[PDB]
Short mmCIF file of C-alpha atoms and ligand atoms in Angstrom, two decimals:
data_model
loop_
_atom_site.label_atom_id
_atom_site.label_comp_id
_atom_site.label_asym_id
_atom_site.label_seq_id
_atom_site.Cartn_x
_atom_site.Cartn_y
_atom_site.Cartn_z
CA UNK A 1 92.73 131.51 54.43
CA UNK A 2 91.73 128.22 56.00
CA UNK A 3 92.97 126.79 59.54
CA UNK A 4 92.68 123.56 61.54
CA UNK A 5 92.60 122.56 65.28
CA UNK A 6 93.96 119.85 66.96
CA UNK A 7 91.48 118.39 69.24
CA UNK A 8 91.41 116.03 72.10
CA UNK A 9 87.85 115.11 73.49
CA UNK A 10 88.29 115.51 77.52
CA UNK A 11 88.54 112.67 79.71
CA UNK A 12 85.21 114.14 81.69
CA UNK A 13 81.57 113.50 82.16
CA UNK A 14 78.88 116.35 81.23
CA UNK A 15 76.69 117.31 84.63
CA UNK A 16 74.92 120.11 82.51
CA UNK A 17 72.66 122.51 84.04
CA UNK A 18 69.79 120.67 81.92
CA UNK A 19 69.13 117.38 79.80
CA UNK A 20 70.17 118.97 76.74
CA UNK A 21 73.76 119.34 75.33
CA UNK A 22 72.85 122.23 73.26
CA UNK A 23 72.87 125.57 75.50
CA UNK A 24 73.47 124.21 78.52
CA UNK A 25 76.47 125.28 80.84
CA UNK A 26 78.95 122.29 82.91
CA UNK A 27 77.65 122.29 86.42
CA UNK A 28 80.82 119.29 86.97
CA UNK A 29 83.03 118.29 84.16
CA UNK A 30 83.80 115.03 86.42
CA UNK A 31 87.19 112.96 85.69
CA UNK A 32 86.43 109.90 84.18
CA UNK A 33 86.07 107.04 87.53
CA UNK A 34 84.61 109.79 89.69
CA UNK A 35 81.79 107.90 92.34
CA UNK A 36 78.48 109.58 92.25
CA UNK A 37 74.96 109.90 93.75
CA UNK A 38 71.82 110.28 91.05
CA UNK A 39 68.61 109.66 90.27
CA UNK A 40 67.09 108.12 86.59
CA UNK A 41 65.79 111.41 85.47
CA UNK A 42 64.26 110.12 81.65
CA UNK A 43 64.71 107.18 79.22
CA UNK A 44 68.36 108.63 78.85
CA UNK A 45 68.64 110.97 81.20
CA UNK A 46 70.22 110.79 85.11
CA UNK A 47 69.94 113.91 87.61
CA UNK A 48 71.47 114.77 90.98
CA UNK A 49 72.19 117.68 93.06
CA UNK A 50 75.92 119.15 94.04
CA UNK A 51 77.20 121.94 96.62
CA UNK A 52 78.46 125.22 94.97
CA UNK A 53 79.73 126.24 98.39
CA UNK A 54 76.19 127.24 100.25
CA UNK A 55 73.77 126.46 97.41
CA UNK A 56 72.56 122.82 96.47
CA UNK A 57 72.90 123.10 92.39
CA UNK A 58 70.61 120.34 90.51
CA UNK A 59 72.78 118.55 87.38
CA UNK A 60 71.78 116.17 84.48
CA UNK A 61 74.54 113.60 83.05
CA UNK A 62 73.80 111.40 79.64
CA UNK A 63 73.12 107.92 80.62
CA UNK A 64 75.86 106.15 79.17
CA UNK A 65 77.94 108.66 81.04
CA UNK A 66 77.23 107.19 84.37
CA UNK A 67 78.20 103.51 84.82
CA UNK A 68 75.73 102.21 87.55
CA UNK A 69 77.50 100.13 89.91
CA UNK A 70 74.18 99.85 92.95
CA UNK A 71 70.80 100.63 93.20
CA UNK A 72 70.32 102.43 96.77
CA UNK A 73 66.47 101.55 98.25
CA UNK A 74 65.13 105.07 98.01
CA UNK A 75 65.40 105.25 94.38
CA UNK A 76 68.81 106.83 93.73
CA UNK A 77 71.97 104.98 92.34
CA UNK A 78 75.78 105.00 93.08
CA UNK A 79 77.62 105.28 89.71
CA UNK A 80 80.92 105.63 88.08
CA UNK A 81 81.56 108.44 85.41
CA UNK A 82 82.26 106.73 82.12
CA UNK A 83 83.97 110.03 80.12
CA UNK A 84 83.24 110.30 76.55
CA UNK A 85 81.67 112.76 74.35
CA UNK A 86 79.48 113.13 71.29
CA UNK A 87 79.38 114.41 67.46
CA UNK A 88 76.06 114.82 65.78
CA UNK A 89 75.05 115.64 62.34
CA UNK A 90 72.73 118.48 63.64
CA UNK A 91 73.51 121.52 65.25
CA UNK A 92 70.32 120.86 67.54
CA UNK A 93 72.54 118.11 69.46
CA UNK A 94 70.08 116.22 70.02
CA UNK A 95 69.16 112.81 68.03
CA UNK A 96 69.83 112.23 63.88
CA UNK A 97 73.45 110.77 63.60
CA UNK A 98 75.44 110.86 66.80
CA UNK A 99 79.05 109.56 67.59
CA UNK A 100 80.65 108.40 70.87
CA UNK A 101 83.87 109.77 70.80
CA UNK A 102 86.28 107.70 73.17
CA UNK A 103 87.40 110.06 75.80
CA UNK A 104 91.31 111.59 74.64
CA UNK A 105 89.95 110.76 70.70
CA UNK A 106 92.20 113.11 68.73
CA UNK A 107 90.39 115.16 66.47
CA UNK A 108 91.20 117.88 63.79
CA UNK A 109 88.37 120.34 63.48
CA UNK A 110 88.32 124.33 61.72
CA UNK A 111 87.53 127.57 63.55
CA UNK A 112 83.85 127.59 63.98
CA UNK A 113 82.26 130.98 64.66
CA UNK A 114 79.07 129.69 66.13
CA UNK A 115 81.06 127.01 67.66
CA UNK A 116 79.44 124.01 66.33
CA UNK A 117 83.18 122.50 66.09
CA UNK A 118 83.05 120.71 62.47
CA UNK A 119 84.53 116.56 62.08
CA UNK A 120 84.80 114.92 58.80
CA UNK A 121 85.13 111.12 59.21
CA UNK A 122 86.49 109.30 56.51
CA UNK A 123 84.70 105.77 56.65
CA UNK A 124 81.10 107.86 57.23
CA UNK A 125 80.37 110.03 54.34
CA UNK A 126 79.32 113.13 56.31
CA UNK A 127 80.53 115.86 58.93
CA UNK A 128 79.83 116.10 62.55
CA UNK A 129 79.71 118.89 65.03
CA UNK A 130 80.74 118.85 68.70
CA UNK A 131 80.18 121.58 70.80
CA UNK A 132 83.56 123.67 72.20
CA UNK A 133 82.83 122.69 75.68
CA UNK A 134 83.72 118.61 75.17
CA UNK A 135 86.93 119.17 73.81
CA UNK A 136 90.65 120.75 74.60
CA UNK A 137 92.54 122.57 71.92
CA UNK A 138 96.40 122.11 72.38
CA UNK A 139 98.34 124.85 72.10
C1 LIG B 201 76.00 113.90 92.23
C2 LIG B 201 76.50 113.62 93.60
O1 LIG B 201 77.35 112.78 93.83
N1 LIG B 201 75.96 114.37 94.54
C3 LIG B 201 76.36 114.29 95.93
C4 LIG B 201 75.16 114.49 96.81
O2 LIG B 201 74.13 113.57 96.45
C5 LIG B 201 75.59 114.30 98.25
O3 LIG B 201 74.49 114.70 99.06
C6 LIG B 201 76.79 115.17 98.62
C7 LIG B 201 77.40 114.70 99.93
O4 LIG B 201 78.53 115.56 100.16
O5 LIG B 201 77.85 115.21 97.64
C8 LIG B 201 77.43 115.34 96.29
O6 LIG B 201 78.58 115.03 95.54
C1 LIG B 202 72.99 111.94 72.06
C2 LIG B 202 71.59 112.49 71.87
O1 LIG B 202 71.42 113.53 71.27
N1 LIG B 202 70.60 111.78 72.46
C3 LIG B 202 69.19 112.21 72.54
C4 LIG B 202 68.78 112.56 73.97
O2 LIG B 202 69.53 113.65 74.51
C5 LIG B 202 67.30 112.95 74.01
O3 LIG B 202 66.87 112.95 75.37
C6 LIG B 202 66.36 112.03 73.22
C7 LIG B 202 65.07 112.77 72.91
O4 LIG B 202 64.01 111.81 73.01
O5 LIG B 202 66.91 111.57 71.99
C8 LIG B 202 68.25 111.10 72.07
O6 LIG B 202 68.63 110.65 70.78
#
């Protein structure tokens, strides 16, 4: 027996606990227009640095997650979470064939046991994966 998912991709930005999307945990899951501190961390890459109560946690966020809105003078930037989130045609989520799914795109997906989440689009001629973490099943 087959089964399918409806799928909404979250209205958040990814702070993950590295610059990879691929098994990495959500330091923030920030609501799309949250204001933020960060630094350029690689060519598509930004970092900063949080407060889990006591303990100063360092994040990374995909750079077309981040609208920067000012460049302070010692380096860092103020930005804007832009909330979106991303289907590849790898399960190494990272380069190939990507996606930007609009944050609340509704999706339809199957039960995935290694939860690489799979999305057939019509006008492309090939599935996509996104990971369990950018997305809310409805129940
Ligand atoms: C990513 C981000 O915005 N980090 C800021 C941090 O830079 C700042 O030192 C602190 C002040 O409370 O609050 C955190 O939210
Ligand atoms: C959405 C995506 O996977 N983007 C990746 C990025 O994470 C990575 O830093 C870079 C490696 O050079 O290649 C990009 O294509």
């Amino acid at each position: 027996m087959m089964e399918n998912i409806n799928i909404v991709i979250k209205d958040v930005g990814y702070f993950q606990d590295k610059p990879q999307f691929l098994n990495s945990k959500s330091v923030r899951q920030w609501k799309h227009g949250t204001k933020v501190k960060l630094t350029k961390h690689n060519s598509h890459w930004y970092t900063g640095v949080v407060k889990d109560g006591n303990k100063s946690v360092r994040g990374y966020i995909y750079h077309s997650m981040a609208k920067v809105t000012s460049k302070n003078s010692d380096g860092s930037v103020n930005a804007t979470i832009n909330a979106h989130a991303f289907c590849w045609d790898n399960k190494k989520l990272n380069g190939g064939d990507f996606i930007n799914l609009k944050r609340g795109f509704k999706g339809i997906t199957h039960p995935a046991s290694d939860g690489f989440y799979p999305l057939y689009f019509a006008s492309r001629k090939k599935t996509f994966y996104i990971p369990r973490y950018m997305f809310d099943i409805k129940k």
